[PDB]
Design a protein around this ligand. Structure first.
Ligand SMILES: [Ca+2]
Ligand SMILES: [Ca+2]
Ligand SMILES: [Ca+2]
Lengths: 107, 99, 84, 76, 114, 99, 80
């Protein structure tokens, strides 16, 4: 008896996902590929963010990822940003950005 | 001892597992993990919803991996979409042949 | 128990000035501060009304973080890091 | 009125005779005090169709749709 | 036969509605909303759709009658909706095909009046 | 012999019916009818979805007229909400009272 | 194929009239053109994506309408 995840080469719970699908009133019937595909995409997107967040944590000389790190990862990355366009990260802050005309004259 | 707290599910372990695959020596705060949990739940509902509508727009009773895919193409930006479509496809192709 | 005070004033000038700092604002009209409060007020009305409705529908007498979250997502102002 | 597994009990229980029990003599008795709707014959054959397959009623002799039944299951 | 009647009325009729309470109920079961659908739900819903549909038609139909027309057309609909604070809000992120816009010229652009 | 168009539903007969209530002498262009039809469908799907989330959020299997109402207070602005609820209530009360 | 120039100055002016605009810089007609292009890309992509998922070679009104809705720009009067 083995996990559908390990059968698909994944970390995310193929089984959990399949159940959430059935139980979420998206459709009457749910193909056996669906949760395998969906779980994998969720894993890919989680991983992408965790690479970046992680880097922005290393950058801060901090061993643990915190919301700021997530925010910096996401906001600094054209695509992640779009995807999370109307999303508000709690305790994330904003990217350092002072409009040009508000600085004094540089030399 | 009194009553033990009722089960609340989470993606936390699966986020951790992933985390260690990417940045082994990197860990993660309670609040951070809560954000990851929102994010996964978010994109579930997004993709599931789009797939629901795809199926229903085509008079289909079934959300198959086809629905999940087209959905992902509709919902993800370029480079993110591709890699998604790969890793999903990979992982079905593996699942299929491991029966 | 007790009916509440006139608190909207507790959104002080300092605080409003700090928030507009986070937003990259350098110089601030005098009139900004009261205008903000009105905006802030309308925002909270709009979310809380929706939250309280989710409360009221669940027949609970205690607004939950999820009520807020569901409302906020309804308002198009999706919030990560507090559930769902 | 009572249900149709309430009605099917009353005919076969009360008198016990013609063709062990069969479809016409049940429907004659049943109509006198159920009070007949047009659906009577339709949901009296359906009541028999799921009562024969559950074990509440067991069949004596027939082929496909037709036959004759009893109340006490076989060997019980 | 000593009175076990077959009768045959339409749910809409009972609730006092033009909108199909039957159709609506069906669309609910079918439309991946929930496992189960109440007996009251589709009456209420249908009522609500009737209310709002009546409301607009009431307003558009006026808009036609002011134009000297007996047919309601998209413009009449677009007028009805955009000049009604509440409806406008409801249909804020909607485009009415062949509606056009409400005549509006920002004041600063109009010439100093003589 | 030709008989091939699909059979696609509409709310047009009820749009017309309700039309003959409010203004019995005036009619409606085809394009107007189809705006109306999109209109109903829009709001159906808006109300339903919220009511579907209300349920699912409150761990229930049943969309009831309680969810329709809650959705309606959520989805319509003040005065429309009021009359919509009011008309909703009335309709249901009248239907329990009939059969 | 450079049909974008089919979106003439006149047609662009007209649109902006209806937007209550009174005077228009010369650089806008190209700026408009780009914007208009980006909009169509985003709508058409999605529309065709619906087309390819129903395995058709002919884009339908519905395809458009379903895309527009995803894009928040819901459209009434073409089979919503
Ligand atoms: Ca790495
Ligand atoms: Ca007959
Ligand atoms: Ca069902």
């Amino acid at each position: 008896a083995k996990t559908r995840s390990s059968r698909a080469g994944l970390q995310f719970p193929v089984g959990r996902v399949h159940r959430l699908l059935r139980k979420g009133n998206y459709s009457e019937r749910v193909g056996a590929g669906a949760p395998v595909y969906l779980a994998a995409v969720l894993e890919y997107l989680t991983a992408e963010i965790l690479e970046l967040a992680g880097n922005a944590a290393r950058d801060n000389k901090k061993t643990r990822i915190i919301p700021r790190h997530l925010q910096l990862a996401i906001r600094n990355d054209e695509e992640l940003n779009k995807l999370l366009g109307r999303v508000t990260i709690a305790q994330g802050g904003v990217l350092p950005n002072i409009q040009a005309v508000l600085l004094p004259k540089k030399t | 001892k009194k009553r033990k707290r009722s089960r609340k599910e989470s993606y936390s372990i699966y986020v951790y597992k992933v985390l260690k695959q990417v940045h082994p020596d990197t860990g993660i705060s309670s609040k951070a993990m809560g954000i990851m949990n929102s994010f996964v739940n978010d994109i579930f509902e997004r993709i599931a919803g789009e797939a629901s509508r795809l199926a229903h727009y085509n008079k289909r009773s079934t959300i198959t991996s086809r629905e999940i895919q087209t959905a992902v193409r509709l919902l993800l930006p370029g480079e993110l979409a591709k890699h998604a479509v790969s890793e999903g496809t990979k992982a079905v192709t593996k699942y299929t042949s491991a029966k | 128990r007790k009916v509440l005070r006139d608190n909207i004033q507790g959104i002080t000038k300092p605080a409003i000035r700090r928030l507009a700092r986070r937003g990259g604002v350098k110089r601030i009209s005098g009139l900004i501060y009261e205008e903000t409060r009105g905006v802030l007020k309308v925002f909270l009305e709009n979310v809380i009304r929706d939250a309280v409705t989710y409360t009221e529908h669940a027949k609970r007498k205690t607004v939950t973080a999820m009520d807020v979250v569901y409302a906020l997502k309804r308002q198009g102002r999706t919030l990560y890091g507090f559930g769902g | 009125h009572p249900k149709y597994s309430d009605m099917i009990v009353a005919a076969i229980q009360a008198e016990k005779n013609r063709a062990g029990s069969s479809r016409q003599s049940i429907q004659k008795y049943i109509k006198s005090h159920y009070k007949v709707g047009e659906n009577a014959d339709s949901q009296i054959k359906l009541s028999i169709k799921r009562l024969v397959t559950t074990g509440v009623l067991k069949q004596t002799k027939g082929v496909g749709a037709s036959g004759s039944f009893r109340l006490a299951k076989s060997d019980e």
